[PDB]
Amino acid sequence: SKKKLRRMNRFTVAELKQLVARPDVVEMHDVTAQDPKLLVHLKATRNSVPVPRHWCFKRKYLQGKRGIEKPPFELPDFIKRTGIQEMREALQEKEEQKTMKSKMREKVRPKMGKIDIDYQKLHDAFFKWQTKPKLTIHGDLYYEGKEFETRLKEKKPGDLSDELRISLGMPVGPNAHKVPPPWLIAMQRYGPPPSYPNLKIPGLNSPIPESCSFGYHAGGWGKPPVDETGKPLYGDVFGTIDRTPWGELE
Amino acid sequence: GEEKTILHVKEMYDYQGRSYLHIPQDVGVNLRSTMPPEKCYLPKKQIHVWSGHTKGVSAVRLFPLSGHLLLSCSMDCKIKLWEVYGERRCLRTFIGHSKAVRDICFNTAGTQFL
Amino acid sequence: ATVYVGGLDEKVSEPLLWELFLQAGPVVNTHMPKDRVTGQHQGYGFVEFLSEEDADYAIKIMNMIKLYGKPIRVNKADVGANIFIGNLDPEIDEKLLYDTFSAFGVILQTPKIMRDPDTGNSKGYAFINFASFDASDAAIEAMNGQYLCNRPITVSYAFKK
Amino acid sequence: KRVLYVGGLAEEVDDKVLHAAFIPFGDITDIQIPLDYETEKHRGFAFVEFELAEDAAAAIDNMNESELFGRTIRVNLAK
Amino acid sequence: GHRVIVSDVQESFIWVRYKRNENQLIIFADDTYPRWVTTASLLDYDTVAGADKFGNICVVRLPPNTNDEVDNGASQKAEVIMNYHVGETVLSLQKT
Amino acid sequence: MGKDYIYAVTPLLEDALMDRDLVHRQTASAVVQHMSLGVYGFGCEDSLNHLLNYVWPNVFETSPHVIQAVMGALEGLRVAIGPCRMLQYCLQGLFHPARKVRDVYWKIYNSIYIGSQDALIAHYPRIYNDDKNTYIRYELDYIL
Amino acid sequence: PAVTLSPNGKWLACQSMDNQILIFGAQNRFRLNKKKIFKGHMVAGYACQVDFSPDMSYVISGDGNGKLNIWDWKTTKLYSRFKAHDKVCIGAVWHPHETSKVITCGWDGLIKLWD
């Protein structure tokens, strides 16, 4: 029939990826386009923004945000320190304790002007300490399950964590520099790994991190790995305008 | 109280026959300087935890001139001497107070403490 | 390359597993392909560090790391198949040890070198869990008195502590 | 079955004595002797790996309960 | 003094770096729009003003923290801080 | 005047655009619409970009009120954020494999086109020319 | 309950039980310097050691909440406040030669090095 003929009229995902000039894009959604050469040229244009994840899914948009426990909302700093938030928390706790009776009584013999609104505290929050939140630039749609996602493609060696340091035996904080991790030890001993030969280890193939210490006890840099003639294992394990804006308002 | 001292290091003397009071020179900062560092910075990370008192520490004292050793006293009736550099080990524990130790002071040379 | 994530912690997630793989070296694969029923961690995993010595030292490091608070070991992926090996060469590395002692069998525990703790330099003894007792036999035989790195080898069946 | 354990060795029995006393049964591949580093002496036992398992079996047959340094030693398959 | 702002004909301004000792020409930051530029100008070390064939003038600024030296189609990009439809093709800007 | 409280309010709308219910997302979308039409021309476009990221996923929806408030948010956001940004959001799904997605993207692009069809002339992509047609626009890349 | 001399011999940091560090001029008639009063920690009932950075850029003190408090000596502004100990932080000492190294001790029985 017509559907069967055009289904056979359709091609292989390898057909596509080899035809196309930019093969990163190809997916079976495109392989299922009634005009896949277009669809792929479009998806490979500059600056364009791909369809959301979730048209395939059977679950609706954030019904996946449903099941796990979710916290409510955390105010901006400049409003916590503006003393209308605390005002509102206090009034809340008051009226949650009071008995049905008392709410009707406050409506009647009212506590008129319990707390006068504070000015210049507010007006300075909103007009003197208001600040840019964290925004996400063009393209990065929010989808459900974003919090889960594993995070990868930091092939960099210097990438360390504080729990990583703790549960590996190394230091957390300003000493994450002057702390060569227990893997830089065998980096100095028999070399850094031969798929990160484009990685230099700090204190083992790189110079001293800020104010490092040479020595062979716990807490130092040891022998920066060098040849018998003096050249290090690699790199250097020891270590040897007018940006003013034009239109601006202070 | 019965006076007792526990050395926790196997070796009292280094490879030159010197005590652990000898100001180290393998430290990347000159601990014999009388001049302060040109500029200080605020600490950001916890580097080390000396664990080994069984009650709260009541005072801490650095070694005079050089700061390479640390004395601590505690409500556990013990005084402890620690390395600030190297492997940061407990070097010695002094025992002989019948009650909690409140304060401690080195002499100017650091050879003795009260 | 392939490392046995043993004592593989249940909730200790493969994401931070791979982040530690990177914080040690070539994070190329972190996988604990689990039970087809459970989903939780299956006690042994494959961690590929695409460099052999990278995985070797990363293993020496991430052993005793408190996974789920518990020490979990990165190793090679108990009726006494452990052999005592003394007059030991102190100048070896751990992956070099695994490749020098793994010729006649697997190593279910890398060579634990009985070194002094005051310094970090050994006095010349170790013990190594191989695959078989006949494996420890053959290896300890071919290296009985034979040429070790600087102090000639002397190997046989190991004592129990 | 080429490696055999030999115990009951007198303090003077050494690797050269063991090689000389076991060499008659066939070429030896290795000799390993546990020693106690605090004393510098052996623990009274050793392991001899001969090239041939048949030579090791003959040495076991001929050496078990034999005399070496005036005392009876034990010889057996090590594993 | 050592940065380049190339301005292609359709995509945008494209900030390019010359590392002399390795002697490389390497990209670090470009724009997020299409802009058929006719002429651009420099306002500072990080800010570039652009004209456009259709009427507009815009001012685009690099974020304040650019990893100048390193080694979709870019790594990190610039922002737009002003947008004006002049009304006629603007063929030359100048800071003066 | 909203140019002041736009920052204070964003993290609450992103909070309620990550699901809480149909009506939750319907209402946060209405709020985005009116913020955008107020802050037209005052530069608070990074914040409306951030909230586009969260509104655009609701594009595939069915309930009339919900999808309708979504479409309203996108017209407001079109004047306030410009029609490049929204043509880029609408690029890839014009010619996509499913007909539900083709239809929603052509609904949007129709409304983006009717209003402000004349900016887009400088926002269209570069679409190469095959054998028997000409598709590049050489008019636009004369040098001068 | 705690007093320390500053590295240059000119100032005494006296921790006062009213939640303030009071600065006295050590060489000059022992007068209180009303321009140098450090506030924003809580030390009521505790003998928390105060110390100075070697360069006199900073003043450090532990609090009853186990927090290390770090003020800029020049502006008197609290610059850093982090939880150092689980219990009361009693000892705070700056390392005399090192730019960032601070040693804290607490009633939790721990001593902590910071950098």
Short mmCIF file of N, CA and C in Angstrom, two decimals, chain B residues 7-8 11 14 24 27 31 40 52 57 61 63 68 70 82 84 88 91 95 98 101:
data_model
loop_
_atom_site.label_atom_id
_atom_site.label_comp_id
_atom_site.label_asym_id
_atom_site.label_seq_id
_atom_site.Cartn_x
_atom_site.Cartn_y
_atom_site.Cartn_z
N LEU B 7 55.87 8.24 74.45
CA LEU B 7 56.34 8.56 73.11
C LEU B 7 55.57 7.68 72.11
N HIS B 8 54.98 8.29 71.08
CA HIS B 8 54.21 7.56 70.05
C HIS B 8 55.01 7.31 68.78
N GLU B 11 61.18 6.53 66.81
CA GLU B 11 62.48 7.18 66.82
C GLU B 11 62.34 8.56 67.46
N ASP B 14 66.23 12.21 64.82
CA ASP B 14 66.36 12.10 63.37
C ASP B 14 67.70 11.46 62.94
N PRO B 24 62.57 22.48 61.37
CA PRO B 24 62.72 21.84 60.07
C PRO B 24 63.03 22.85 58.96
N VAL B 27 60.58 22.17 55.05
CA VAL B 27 59.35 22.96 54.88
C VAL B 27 59.61 24.10 53.88
N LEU B 31 60.88 28.75 58.55
CA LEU B 31 60.42 28.81 59.94
C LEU B 31 61.43 29.45 60.92
N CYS B 40 48.82 37.93 54.45
CA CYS B 40 47.99 36.80 54.83
C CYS B 40 46.73 36.69 53.95
N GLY B 52 42.65 12.34 68.95
CA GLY B 52 43.34 11.49 69.93
C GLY B 52 43.25 11.95 71.39
N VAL B 57 39.54 19.80 74.14
CA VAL B 57 40.82 20.52 74.22
C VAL B 57 40.58 21.89 74.85
N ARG B 61 48.95 25.67 71.96
CA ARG B 61 50.14 26.53 71.86
C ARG B 61 51.02 26.03 70.73
N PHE B 63 54.82 26.01 69.02
CA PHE B 63 56.22 26.11 69.41
C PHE B 63 56.71 27.55 69.21
N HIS B 68 56.54 24.91 64.33
CA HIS B 68 56.59 23.57 63.74
C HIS B 68 56.01 22.45 64.62
N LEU B 70 53.14 21.69 68.00
CA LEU B 70 51.92 22.12 68.66
C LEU B 70 51.78 21.35 69.98
N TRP B 82 52.36 17.51 69.10
CA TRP B 82 52.03 17.16 67.73
C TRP B 82 52.97 17.87 66.76
N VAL B 84 53.26 19.89 63.29
CA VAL B 84 52.40 20.77 62.44
C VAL B 84 52.65 20.51 60.95
N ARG B 88 52.18 15.06 60.46
CA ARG B 88 51.32 15.64 61.51
C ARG B 88 51.00 14.71 62.68
N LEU B 91 53.45 13.14 68.56
CA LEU B 91 54.83 12.81 68.90
C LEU B 91 54.89 12.23 70.31
N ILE B 95 51.37 12.57 80.94
CA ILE B 95 50.34 12.13 81.89
C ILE B 95 50.91 12.37 83.29
N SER B 98 46.16 14.98 88.00
CA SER B 98 45.04 14.22 88.57
C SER B 98 43.68 14.73 88.07
N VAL B 101 43.65 19.63 82.59
CA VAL B 101 44.67 20.67 82.36
C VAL B 101 43.98 21.86 81.70
#
